[PDB]
Design a protein around this ligand. Structure first.
Ligand SMILES: CC(C)=CCC/C(C)=C/CC/C(C)=C/[C@H](O)P(=O)(O)O
Ligand SMILES: [Mg+2]
Ligand SMILES: [Mg+2]
Ligand SMILES: [Mg+2]
Length: 532
């Protein structure tokens, strides 16, 4: 029965008229602050620590997307010079920034901070700025970085101990880091927090950078607001709120998801297309889970595979609405890309959609039979039901630079994509185990793991956590140069992994239950603008 809570928002987003006067004002001053900030990056005689801090600040402020070349060449130069700025803070920052950019900098730089036993000198426990940067850096480690195996536990215990007596805004920056690291967090979300809660309150803040950050964030927010309005109208013209009452109305939440994948203005068309897909597949998921019967679902799955409007008659009236909306959406996609001549790539997203549906069917079949497959079998089916292979393929649709070779690479299920999918699965299964078990779904991850290995619930979740950790180290390795495809195409995958982490931060389904997790984010990103 129904159960799902209605949209918290309402028509709050259908309407958005951009005051073109304020937009142009912001744009004009931004361009000036842009070159001022560019000149700052091009400064000659700056120290390593100062240069790393500048780059770090510009990134955290969310304005680094304007200087991808400038920042790259500086980090490239820093990578090849191998200068030993000897302190922990500068070292950890140097490590993180280079790694996040693909530069495979050796982790032995952390040797000078460890004793002959390989552990961190407990004497560094009084260096907060060093401990903090080390904490952030501990989240970007790969499988070849065992030198940092105790870095997270080290920095954490000492950061928690020192936190209560630190001056603001440092105290808040640390408290926030311990709750959410920079690397595994959503870009806009972390930027919003840095700009308003940290940098603005920083005594040594650079006013030009703060002004730039605030204006830019607010200007882009106007675009996000426009996009969300366009997708809200599109969502109402479908009126699935009344025709398909069993489904979830989370179009705003789906926009947040697409905004987490990419926020840059150039990805406007991409975000819009992606929001429509997530929203659409959410219904298909809602159909197989809380509505359709064994027969109906089998007819639906088969209909999707054929991908022809003629098969609509075999489907009951309510499924006819879903089925047609889906084909039309893809016809719209083909039409949007008709201009550039990138219509020939829509099929990739479709083949992935069919895959998701096949597994949705298998998932229900297992539920009916009361099947509890071994972990091996479970994953071979449950990985696609996360829809991550699908969403990742979709994100490329609007990306004007995406070629055939990029989709070709993605179809082979790369390790980075594979890792991203695993994280989404493991995290969802750890959070939703108990709830799904109460509904009779004994085919869930933790359950399969428990009976397959003969371990308790605690051990099963603990092992799943290790799978996510491994997946994270795998994602970190995928970013390292030479990348199989352009970095532009690896970020969406990375972001997808970031969104799950952030959504299930309180170990609860954030999409189905937005209010506690997603609500604040949506308010801070799509409602309230950073007050200047
Ligand atoms: C709650 C949802 C739909 C969030 C959408 C974003 C998403 C990738 C979340 C993780 C995987 C899914 C798809 C869970 C399903 O809902 P389920 O466990 O019901 O198959
Ligand atoms: Mg569901
Ligand atoms: Mg489902
Ligand atoms: Mg689940």
């Amino acid at each position: 029965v129904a159960d799902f809570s209605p949209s918290l928002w309402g028509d709050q987003f259908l309407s958005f008229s951009i005051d073109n006067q304020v937009a142009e004002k912001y744009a004009q001053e931004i361009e000036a602050l842009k070159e001022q900030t560019r000149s700052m990056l091009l400064a000659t005689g700056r120290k390593l620590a100062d240069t790393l801090n500048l780059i770090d600040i510009i990134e955290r402020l969310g304005i680094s997307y304007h200087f991808e070349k400038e920042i790259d060449e500086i980090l490239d130069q820093i990578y090849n010079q191998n200068s030993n700025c000897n302190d922990l803070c500068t070292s950890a920052l140097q490590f993180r920034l280079l790694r996040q950019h693909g530069f495979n900098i050796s982790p032995e730089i952390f040797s000078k901070f460890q004793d002959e036993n390989g552990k961190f000198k407990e004497s560094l426990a009084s260096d907060v700025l060093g401990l903090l940067n080390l904490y952030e850096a501990s989240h970007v480690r790969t499988h070849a970085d065992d030198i940092l195996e105790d870095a997270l536990a080290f920095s954490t215990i000492h950061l928690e101990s020192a936190a209560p007596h630190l001056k603001s805004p440092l105290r808040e920056q640390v408290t926030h880091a311990l709750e959410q690291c920079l690397h595994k967090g959503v870009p806009r979300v972390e930027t919003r927090f840095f700009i308003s809660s940290i940098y603005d309150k920083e005594q040594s803040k650079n006013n030009v950078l703060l002004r730039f950050a605030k204006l830019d964030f607010n200007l882009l927010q106007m675009l996000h607001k426009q996009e969300l309005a366009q997708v809200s109208r599109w969502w109402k013209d479908l009126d699935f709120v009344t025709t398909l009452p069993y489904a979830r109305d989370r179009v705003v939440e789906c926009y947040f998801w697409a905004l987490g994948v990419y926020f840059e203005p150039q990805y406007s068309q991409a975000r819009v297309m992606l929001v429509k897909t997530i929203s659409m597949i959410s219904i298909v998921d809602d159909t197989f889970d809380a509505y359709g019967t064994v027969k109906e679902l089998e007819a639906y799955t088969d209909a999707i595979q054929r991908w022809d409007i003629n098969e609509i008659d075999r489907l009951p009236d309510y499924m006819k609405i879903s089925y047609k909306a889906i084909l039309d959406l893809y016809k719209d996609y083909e039409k949007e890309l008709s201009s550039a001549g990138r219509s020939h790539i829509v099929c990739h997203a479709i083949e992935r959609m069919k895959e998701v549906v096949r597994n949705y069917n298998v998932e229900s079949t297992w539920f009916i039979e009361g099947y509890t497959p071994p972990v091996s079998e479970y994953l071979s089916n449950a990985l696609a039901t996360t829809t991550y292979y699908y969403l990742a393929t979709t994100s490329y649709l609007g990306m004007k630079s995406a070629t055939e070779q990029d989709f070709e690479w993605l179809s082979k299920n790369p390790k980075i994509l594979e890792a991203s999918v695993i994280i989404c699965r493991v995290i969802d299964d750890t959070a939703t185990y108990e709830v799904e078990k109460s509904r009779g779904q004994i085919a869930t991850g933790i359950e399969c793991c428990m009976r397959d290995y003969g371990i308790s619930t605690k051990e099963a979740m603990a092992k799943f956590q290790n799978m996510a950790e491994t997946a994270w180290k795998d994602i970190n390795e995928g970013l390292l140069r030479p990348t199989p495809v352009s970095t532009e195409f690896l970020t969406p995958i990375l972001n997808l992994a970031r969104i799950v982490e952030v959504t299930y931060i309180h170990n609860l389904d954030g999409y189905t239950h937005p209010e506690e997790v997603l609500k604040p984010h949506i308010i801070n990103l799509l409602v309230d603008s950073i007050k200047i």
